[PDB]
Design a protein around this ligand. Structure first.
Ligand SMILES: [Cl-]
Ligand SMILES: [Cl-]
Ligand SMILES: [Cl-]
Length: 231
């Protein structure tokens, strides 16, 4: 209703910040066609980074949405969206709960739950059964039994429960270390070339697309934004 946007003027310049990306040892990629990367040129990075262009686009501005800020989306609105999503069908309540506890945007938490469980169909989320809607301890030895093992250990015997305990894990490493918007996660304006999430120059733009997609399904729009400014 009343978007609240904060603008941080580095006083720097897009020309400076983009060439800085080009000197990184972990060189940037460009999926000109899906499934294949190539290093991006100065224009490729300067365009993908140009917040002036990303702020004007309704799907692209979501990279500036603050992920560390819960929005009070109605729990009913959430279930209308979680409907039919395998397990997780209900419990937007368990989700609003994980959101207010850790101070983290709700859509960021749910899309993350949706990816790890394949929209509620993952065996780990499927769960007598213990559950895991966040892939906790699942990227190492045995993703299925090792994760079932974690969930069994913390009492995630029910879906609202796997959601509460898995939630503390989301955003500590990125959203809580200051990279609170998909743009900061990609370009890191406080420390450029530092702690960046991926080489693809389109990574905040793609993720902004999927987020705004969930916002539209859900029935809401973002309210807290943060746009870096170069001049
Ligand atoms: Cl702030
Ligand atoms: Cl397994
Ligand atoms: Cl994170």
């Amino acid at each position: 209703a009343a978007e609240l946007i904060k603008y941080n003027q580095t006083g720097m310049t897009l020309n400076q910040v983009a060439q800085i990306q080009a000197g990184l040892q972990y060189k940037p990629q460009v999926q000109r066609v899906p499934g294949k990367w190539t290093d991006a040129n100065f224009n490729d990075v300067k365009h993908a980074m140009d917040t002036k262009r990303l702020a004007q686009d309704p799907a692209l501005k979501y990279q500036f949405l603050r992920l560390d800020q819960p929005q009070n989306i109605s729990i009913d609105k959430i279930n209308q969206f979680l409907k039919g999503k395998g397990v997780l069908e209900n419990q937007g309540a368990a989700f609003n709960k994980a959101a207010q506890m850790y101070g983290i945007n709700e859509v960021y938490l749910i899309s993350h739950a949706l990816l790890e469980t394949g929209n509620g169909t993952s065996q780990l989320a499927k769960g007598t059964k213990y559950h895991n809607v966040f892939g906790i301890a699942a990227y190492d030895n045995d993703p299925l039994r090792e994760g079932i093992k974690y969930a069994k250990q913390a009492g995630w015997d029910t879906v609202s429960k796997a959601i509460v305990g898995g939630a503390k894990f989301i955003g500590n490493s990125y959203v809580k270390a200051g990279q609170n918007t998909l743009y900061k996660m990609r370009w890191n304006p406080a420390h450029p070339g530092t702690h960046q999430y991926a080489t693809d120059v389109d990574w905040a733009n793609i993720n902004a697309k999927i987020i705004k997609g969930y916002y539209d399904k859900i029935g809401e729009v973002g309210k807290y934004f943060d746009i870096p400014q170069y001049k």
